[PDB]
Swiss-Prot record, chain E:
Task of the protein: Precursor of the fusion protein processed in the biosynthesis of the S protein and the formation of virus particle. Mediates fusion of the virion and cellular membranes by functioning as a class I viral fusion protein. Contains two viral fusion peptides that are unmasked after cleavage. The S2/S2' cleavage occurs during virus entry at the cell membrane by host TMPRSS2 or during endocytosis by host CSTL.
Protein's recorded name: Spike protein S2
Mutation effect (N20K): In strain: Omicron/BA.1, Omicron/BA.2, Omicron/BA.2.12.1, Omicron/BA.2.75, Omicron/BA.4, Omicron/BA.5, Omicron/BQ.1.1, Omicron/XBB.1.5, Omicron/EG.5.1
Protein source organism: Severe acute respiratory syndrome coronavirus 2 (2019-nCoV)
Gene: S
Length: 413, 193, 371, 99, 49
């Protein structure tokens, strides 16, 4: 109070020294059950894959994708992502998600990347230069090699494939001047070969299953978003909370108000969130702003003593010598008395505090005045037999200081 | 064969809940006392549309929404069926599938906002036939699909009223429960103004 | 509770200590208003156990112990007539509780009933209520015998007049217009102040966490600055509205204090200050945010035409009325008090003699009986 | 930069002059009350109760203060009351006598 | 009477409504002032001819 009054001596009175707000603890977040999940399982654990010339594309839509299952798995040889962070898209959404799966061999996995050339990159599967997505591959010798699957790849093509183009035509490739008649011959070759996936092949010659996730993020609606962590709730404790994207700080409590089956969160008046239903358990809670109020000291004046009695306004002080609850707040450091005296320092709610003897600050319900019942009767009169003349002082302000402010010299100078 | 749209034809604007308070909402609504075109075919979709139908034998089936409906561009094809209601972006009536959804007076409100299709429905114990009595009801049981096209056709496959929503503010009174007991139309009348 | 906004606000200056100082000033001014209006009684006066106030009936305006609030019937009616913690807004409770104000008014009412106006001057000196009403009739110009001869009728009129107030308050709606208007104005101000938060104020979004989240701090600073300046402007507007309205209510509270003093504590000769008609007495009742005065006034009725004369010319000298007015019913001349027709024989005792006949114009010959 | 400074200093000067106007209105109310007291309590004797001191007003004197005025109100306060039996009238010879 | 300005003004909030309400309050107060000062007589009185 000496600080906020800019003095080393403060007079007898009650001064609002500061404000006090209970700080929130253990913030909580909640989001509805993850009932619908994205079909990455039927893409990655598909019993049969597809030849690289006829690569399979799976469109991912209207689902929540938990990409952590992909990068937390320890059964991948390569997980190269371009222009996107797989560890950072579990709180991200995409306007479009594609999943391309096929089978190649070891030394050809390096071709599934932007700006590559070769049999696979030019005639089977081409990625764009500005590719945004991940290239995931793993050895599949235990599945695609026996001593009965038949995987194919394209040998020739009259022009290189555009990015994400797919050619499945089995027409005879014309390499020379003479035109083939849909039949193989001189300067005429069938465009597809089979892979020679033998279990005893070298590592670079064994089959590798490849999945290519590609993403798009335009200023357009999105339907593929990852999962959202959720935690348990609390009661009667000022907490920062996140309910279905709505952030707020308060004490959550049980509420008798019933929502309607469609209403999520409610506002009593003045566009202030007052109730909210949790998405998991489908239960309504009332939000109350956790206790806050001005803290004001009561001091009898410095020269009298240095004692003070703190008053935390409108705070039921179950929380931070003798702690006395009053209808104007909580009083810390002031003894409560039963008798009543004339009001000295106005606390509020019909309660005043004063410094009196040993030498303590006492709070009491102020006395309106002395009580007397003047003796009325239908035939009794009280006549004055004497008098006192009395001079009293009435003080009245009549004027102020005639201040004049030069606008320009004050503003600019 | 027009017929004035009465008070009926108002829906819950958003998900929020309001108890015993009056609110003002600014979005598409069906005007009070606006002569809807009772049909007894072909219907446009300039904007969101209030569709209200009465069938003793439930003859009417789902709505075939379409921007062009020439098989060139994707349709919406709401249909309904004893077991379930099926809606696909792609039976007897026909004309690159993007999305399919299957789930479970007769007020119906359909609108497309920023590519999101919204449906509002209500069931009423009608006692007078061939007139929709002025009364109040609304709900928001909906299915949202991000089409992003401007539908222009209905082709509903035994008479149905059809009215067109307009962007005019309303004042909705809210019950203690949170339901919309009543509403008034701001620009309808100077008294309502 | 946003730290970066806290810093950007800090750099503006001492605006908020100033706003807080203005608001706390009007806050303590309100307590001063209530205490000044009601705390004009030195010591609370208990009313006697048995009510025999000369036929007058004060049961309605006197406190009833049966009620838990311990306030009078009309005060509870007035309380029922009116119909009276979100983000940084707090409403401090008034220093004087409603029960304390009811006790103040009960003390004032018991004092004015039992002791008349003596208790305001000093020690409470008790007079029988009939004799005090006679004092007050002498105050308004009517002689005191008029009350005693008509005491039962006056008691019945006062009782029925108090009864009419109960009907007027209970049935007629919007009787407490001014007080309800005060409550509505304060609710309106707080409500619009809270509504201003949703306003965009020219930034990309109103909600501050969102504007913080999806922009870099250098760019977000500008949008946050727009939000801060708009919200600070709205809060400054609310504070200045409160200051002006508090000035107006202070004027009304000073008027209530003056009426409490000049009408409850004492009889006032200022015409139309307290009621319509010559003022007899007034009683205070505690409304929720104000005081309701019941003004007991004396209004004359059933007037009669008379022929009057300025002076009576008898035996060559002019007799003027001491306190009355000469009136003639057609053949005889009488002296009557102006406010109440009570004729008396013209005598030298009640008519003083000055001058002679010729000077004064309009005088009429008659005989002044000499006792 | 000067624009920001101008706006801030202008807002401060504006709120200062508004608070000065309100304080001046309060002081004008007080000065009108003081003029009424000086006219009704010094230039004469006032019957309106508790306007000038507690008790029946005899007279009053003004004294100059730095920014105001201090009235010394001389009032008559009855004291040493005595009980008596009382009656409104007196019956004598079949006539009522009132004081 | 420019829509582009009015749409920007909508963002500021209820300032115009507040100003209109304050001014209309002053307006009705002026009628109240004249009524309180001059309408002290119940019924119009005519001086005798
Ligand atoms: C009227 O109603 O009230 C006034 C009050 O001012 C009253 O006048 C007071 O009378 C007192 C009684 O005589 C007076 O007290 C004494 O004064 C003499 C001086 O004349 C003084 O020597 C006296 O003290 C001695 O006696 C007392 C008591 O025995 C004792 O305690 C002392 O130690 C000392 O031995 O002292 C008294 O003080 O008292 C007051 O001076 C006097 N006041 C004034 C201002 O003159 O006046 C009226 O008598 C009274 N009238 C009626 C009809 O009741
Ligand atoms: C009031 O109640 O009493 C007085 C007192 O008597 C009354 O005054 C009287 O007024 C008369 C009208 O002026 C007065 O009559 C004349 O006075 C003059 C003045 O001396 C006198 O010369 C006059 O007589 C002549 O004229 C009359 C006709 O007027 C004629 O018959 C005579 O024979 C003669 O030729 O005489 C009148 O006497 O009349 C009275 O003298 C005068 N009385 C006195 C004592 O001065 O004053 C008032 O008239 C009367 N007012 C009312 C309303 O009754
Ligand atoms: C207490 C008492 O008896 N006072 C009377 C007083 O009433 C009376 O003056 C009227 O009282 O004034 C009215 C004016 O409204 C007056 O009446 C007129 O009547 C004619 C037709 O008769 C109408 O055409 C006029 O428009 C007007 O209404 O009535 C007339 O002067 C009085 N009315 C009465 C007596 O009924 C005065 C008269 O001098 O006498 C007082 O003693
Ligand atoms: C949660 C809540 O209060 N919901 C309220 C809903 O929003 O509004 C309706 C209608 O205004 C409200 O319904 C009525 O509530 C009362 C009290 O809860 C209900 O009163 C009881 O009814 C039961 C049987 O239902 C009796 O056994 C009991 O004695 C009470 O009489 O009163 C009343 O029945 C409800 N009306 C119904 C169910 O139609 O509904 C509802 O509270
Ligand atoms: C205080 O002045 O008055 C209290 C009145 O309630 C007093 O509290 C009571 O004290 C008695 C005796 O100790 C107990 O039997 C009661 O249970 C108790 N009641 C309550 C509500 O606390 O309290 C209190 O003792 C008294 N204190 C003093 C110092 O006089
Ligand atoms: C909307 C929804 O599906 N909510 C369920 C959520 O997804 O999963 C929890 C987990 O079981 C679910 O909680 C169960 O709810 C039922 C409803 O009455 C209770 O009977 C169960 O006890 C409860 N079980 C648990 C573990 O919470 O919760 C939600 O219903
Ligand atoms: C002038 C007057 O009314 N005097 C009455 C006084 O005010 O009250 C007493 C009360 O005792 C009154 O005298 C009577 O007292 C008996 C006592 O039992 C009552 O029963 C009588 O009702 C009462 N008389 C009246 C008229 O009330 O004395 C005085 O009369
Ligand atoms: C009489 C009947 O049930 N008719 C069809 C009903 O209206 O809709 C469902 C759509 O789900 C229909 O069944 C589907 O038939 C196709 C074709 O064989 C199957 O691929 C779907 O799995 C199957 N769906 C369901 C839910 O059964 O059935 C009915 O034919
Ligand atoms: C002495 C006396 O009779 N005082 C009455 C007082 O002046 O008015 C109240 C209110 O009417 C009066 O109390 C009511 O009296 C009637 C009898 O006519 C009873 O029926 C009522 O119950 C009673 N109370 C109320 C609240 O009306 O009280 C006093 O009698
Ligand atoms: C026109 C008229 O009747 N005037 C009367 C006047 O207004 O009052 C007096 C005094 O009462 C009145 O005269 C008295 O009337 C009473 C009526 O009861 C008679 O008993 C008296 O005899 C009569 N005369 C007197 C008292 O001298 O006169 C007028 O009649
Ligand atoms: C000035 C004076 O002496 N007044 C008294 C008055 O004349 O009589 C009444 C009743 O006798 C009196 O009031 C009672 O006085 C005694 C003794 O002082 C007290 O004990 C009583 O409490 C008091 N009140 C009663 C009896 O109701 O009152 C006056 O003091
Ligand atoms: C003040 O409270 O204490 C001073 C000693 O520190 C003392 O000199 C001074 O008189 C005191 N003031 C009052 C008003 O008593
Ligand atoms: C207090 O605020 O909280 C206690 C536990 O939460 C409760 O028992 C007590 O009654 C409350 N008191 C008040 C005055 O609110
Ligand atoms: C091996 C198995 O049983 N299931 C796999 C799972 O391990 C893998 O995480 C998932 C990827 O979507 O693909 C499934 O087929
Ligand atoms: C020719 C044509 O429109 N092809 C579209 C393609 O553009 C779109 O990206 C894809 C989304 O599933 O659906 C195809 O039918």
């Amino acid at each position: 109070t000496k600080c906020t009054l800019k003095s080393f001596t403060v007079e007898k009175g009650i001064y609002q020294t500061s404000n006090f707000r209970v700080q929130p603890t253990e913030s909580i977040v909640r989001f509805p059950n993850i009932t619908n999940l994205c079909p990455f399982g039927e893409v990655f654990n598909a019993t049969r894959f597809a030849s690289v010339y006829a690569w399979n594309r799976k469109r991912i839509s209207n689902c929540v994708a938990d990409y952590s299952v992909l990068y937390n798995s320890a059964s991948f040889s390569t997980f190269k992502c371009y222009g996107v962070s797989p560890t950072k898209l579990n709180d991200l959404c995409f306007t479009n998600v594609y999943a391309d799966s096929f089978v190649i061999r070891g030394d050809e996995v390096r071709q599934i990347a932007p700006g590559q050339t070769g049999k696979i990159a030019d005639y089977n599967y081409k990625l764009p230069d500005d590719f945004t997505g991940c290239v995931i591959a793993w050895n599949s010798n235990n599945l695609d090699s026996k001593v009965n699957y038949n995987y194919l790849y394209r040998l020739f093509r009259k022009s290189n494939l555009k990015p994400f183009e797919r050619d499945i035509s089995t027409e005879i490739y014309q390499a020379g001047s003479t035109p083939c008649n849909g039949v193989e011959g001189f300067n005429c070759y069938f465009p597809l070969q089979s892979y020679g996936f033998q279990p005893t092949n070298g590592v670079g010659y064994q089959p590798y299953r490849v999945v290519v996730l590609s993403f798009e993020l335009l200023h357009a609606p999105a339907t593929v978003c990852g999962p959202k962590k959720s935690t348990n709730l609390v009661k009667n404790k000022c907490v920062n909370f996140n309910f279905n994207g709505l952030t707020g700080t308060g004490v959550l409590t049980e509420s008798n108000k019933k929502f309607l089956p469609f209403q999520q969160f409610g506002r009593d008046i003045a566009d202030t969130t007052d109730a909210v239903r949790d998405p998991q358990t489908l239960e309504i809670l009332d939000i109350t702003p956790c206790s806050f109020g001005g803290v004001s000291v009561i001091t009898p004046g410095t020269n009298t003593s240095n004692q003070v009695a703190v008053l935390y306004q409108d705070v039921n002080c179950t929380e931070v010598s003798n702690v006395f609850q009053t209808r104007a707040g909580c009083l810390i450091g002031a003894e409560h008395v039963n008798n009543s005296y004339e009001c000295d320092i106005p606390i509020g709610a019909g309660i005043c505090a004063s410094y009196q003897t040993s030498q303590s600050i006492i709070a009491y319900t102020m006395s309106l005045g002395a009580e007397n019942s003047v003796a009325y009767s239908n035939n009794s009169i009280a006549i004055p037999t004497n008098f006192t003349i009395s001079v009293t002082t009435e003080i009245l302000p009549v004027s102020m200081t005639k201040t004049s402010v030069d606008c320009t010299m004050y503003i600019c100078g | 064969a027009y017929t004035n749209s009465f008070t009926r034809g108002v829906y819950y604007p958003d998900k929020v809940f309001r108890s015993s308070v009056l609110h003002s909402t600014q979005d598409l609504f069906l005007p009070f006392f606006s002569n809807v075109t009772w049909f007894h075919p072909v219907l446009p979709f300039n904007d969101g549309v209030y569709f209200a139908s009465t069938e003793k034998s439930n003859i009417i089936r789902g709505w075939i929404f379409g921007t062009t409906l020439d098989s060139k561009t994707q349709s919406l094809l709401i249909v309904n069926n004893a077991t379930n209601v099926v809606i696909k972006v792609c039976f007897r009536v026909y004309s690159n599938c993007t999305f399919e959804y299957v789930s479970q007076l007769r007020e119906f409100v359909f609108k497309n906002i920023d590519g999101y299709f919204k449906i509002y429905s209500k069931h009423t114990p009608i006692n007078l036939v061939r007139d929709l009595p002025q009364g109040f009801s609304a709900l928001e049981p909906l299915v949202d699909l991000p089409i992003g096209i401007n539908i222009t056709r209905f082709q509903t496959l035994a008479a149905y009223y059809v009215g067109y929503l307009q962007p005019r503010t309303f004042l909705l009174k809210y019950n203690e429960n949170g339901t919309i007991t009543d509403a008034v139309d701001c620009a309808l009348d100077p008294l309502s103004e | 509770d946003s730290t970066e906004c806290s810093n950007l606000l800090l750099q503006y200056g001492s605006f908020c200590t100033q706003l807080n100082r203005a608001l706390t000033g009007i806050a303590v001014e309100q307590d001063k208003n209530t205490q000044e209006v009601f705390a004009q009684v030195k010591q609370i006066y208990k009313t006697p156990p048995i009510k025999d106030f000369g036929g007058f009936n004060f049961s309605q305006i006197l406190p009833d112990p049966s009620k838990p609030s311990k306030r009078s019937f009309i005060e509870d009616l007035l309380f029922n007539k009116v119909t009276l913690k979100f983000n940084g807004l707090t409403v401090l409770p008034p220093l004087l509780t409603d029960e304390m104000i009811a006790q103040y008014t009960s003390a004032l009412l018991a004092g004015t009933i039992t002791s008349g106006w003596t208790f305001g001057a000093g020690a409470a000196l008790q007079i029988p209520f009939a004799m005090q009403m006679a004092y007050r009739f002498n105050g308004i110009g009517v002689t005191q015998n008029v009350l005693y001869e008509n005491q039962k009728l006056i008691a019945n009129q006062f009782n029925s007049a108090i009864g009419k107030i109960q009907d007027s308050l209970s049935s007629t709606a919007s009787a407490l217009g001014k007080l309800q208007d005060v409550v509505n104005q304060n609710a309106q101000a707080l409500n619009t102040l809270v509504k201003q938060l949703s306003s965009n104020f020219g930034a990309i979004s109103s909600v501050l966490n969102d504007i913080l989240s999806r922009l870099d701090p250098p760019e977000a600073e500008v949008q946050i600055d727009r939000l801060i300046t708009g919200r600070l402007q709205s809060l400054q507007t609310y504070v200045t509205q409160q200051l002006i309205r508090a000035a107006e209510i202070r004027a009304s509270a000073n008027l209530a204090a003056t009426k409490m003093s000049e009408c409850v504590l004492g009889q006032s000769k200022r015409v139309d200050f307290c009621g319509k008609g010559y003022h007899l007495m007034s009683f205070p009742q505690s409304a929720p945010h104000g005081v309701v005065f019941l003004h007991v006034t004396y209004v004359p009725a059933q007037e009669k035409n008379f022929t009057t004369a300025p002076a009576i010319c008898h035996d060559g000298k002019a007799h003027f009325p001491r306190e009355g007015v000469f009136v003639s019913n057609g053949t005889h001349w009488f002296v009557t008090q102006r406010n109440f027709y009570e004729p008396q024989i013209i005598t030298t005792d009640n008519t003083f003699v000055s001058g002679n006949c010729d000077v004064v114009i309009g005088i009429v010959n008659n005989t002044v009986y000499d006792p």
